[model samples]
Target: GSMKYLNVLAKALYDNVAESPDELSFRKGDIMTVLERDTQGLDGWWLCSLHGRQGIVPGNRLKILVGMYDKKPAGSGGSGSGSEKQDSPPPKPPRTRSCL
Candidate 1:
């Protein structure tokens, strides 16, 4: 019952320049669809499809995307805690010794 292909729409976690003839090049956060995943057969090489081109990509650096979003961590802080100004802290206030 292998009529339709089951693949993972993954994102490249790291930038990789093509190392070999079969290896594919992918940039960080780039979208790619893995047609086949063999983590042990070829020492973890996944066959991926990028821009309709089939090539082998590293399975280690590719992460599966849940949906359209990559699910990035939210940034916190800056909502009026207690302090008014941070103000730069000084080591010795101004000049130290001989001016040079």
Candidate 2:
């Protein structure tokens, strides 16, 4: 019931653009342009590019809302569908290492 888990590909916005958290520029089901990424395992440390522009942000900063981008299209539907979910890679199952 999942596609792929893009740990780095996630939502990101500029504070100046969105004055308030409620006024978030990046929507729930939006595809973000990752300008740069340098984070480790949900530690929240990533840099991304938006509309040709770029910024620095944490990893866990962006959240994944269920039924939002899951199974939703990425470049098919035009912007403004607001609520039209899209296709996002399935979440990677938790990884475990054997000490044996």
Candidate 3:
């Protein structure tokens, strides 16, 4: 199966300090965008990119931009044409985790 991104921006509601390379730290009110949400082995985590950085963030701590990216009526100036493209930072090698 292919992974899909939300195509919309999200805001952090609380800080999520990274415990591993797969995780990312963000302060409350920080704006980030989803790059992938495939939960194959993920546990309520969303792959996000912010300020040229990419890492995983807890989904529970994010809130999607509704009115800004929500479906607007036809003829409205919200035809999803104003969304911004995320220029993510260069990819980093995958991280390896060891069980305790």
**Residue-pair clashes per candidate, as listed?**
0, 12, 0
| The 10-residue segment with the lowest total lDDT in model 2 | 91-100
lDDT of each: 0.61, 0.39, 0.62
Evaluate model 1: give its TM-score: 0.57
**RMSD list, candidates in order:** 19.1, 13.0, 11.2
Model 3 TM-score (2 dp): 0.56
Q: Could you say which candidate leads in TM-score? A: 1
lDDT of 1: 0.61
Runs of candidate 1 exceeding 4 Å displacement: 1-3, 66-100
Write down the RMSD of candidate 3 (Cα, Å). 11.2
- Candidate 2 per-residue lDDT, tens place, 66-94, comes to 34344753552235544344655333222
lDDT of 3 at 29: 74
| Model 2 segments more than 4 A misplaced | 1-8, 11-24, 38-45, 61-77, 81-100
Residue 95 error for model 1, in Å? 60
Error of 3 at 52 (Å): 0.8
TM-score of 2: 0.33
Candidate whose lDDT is highest: 3
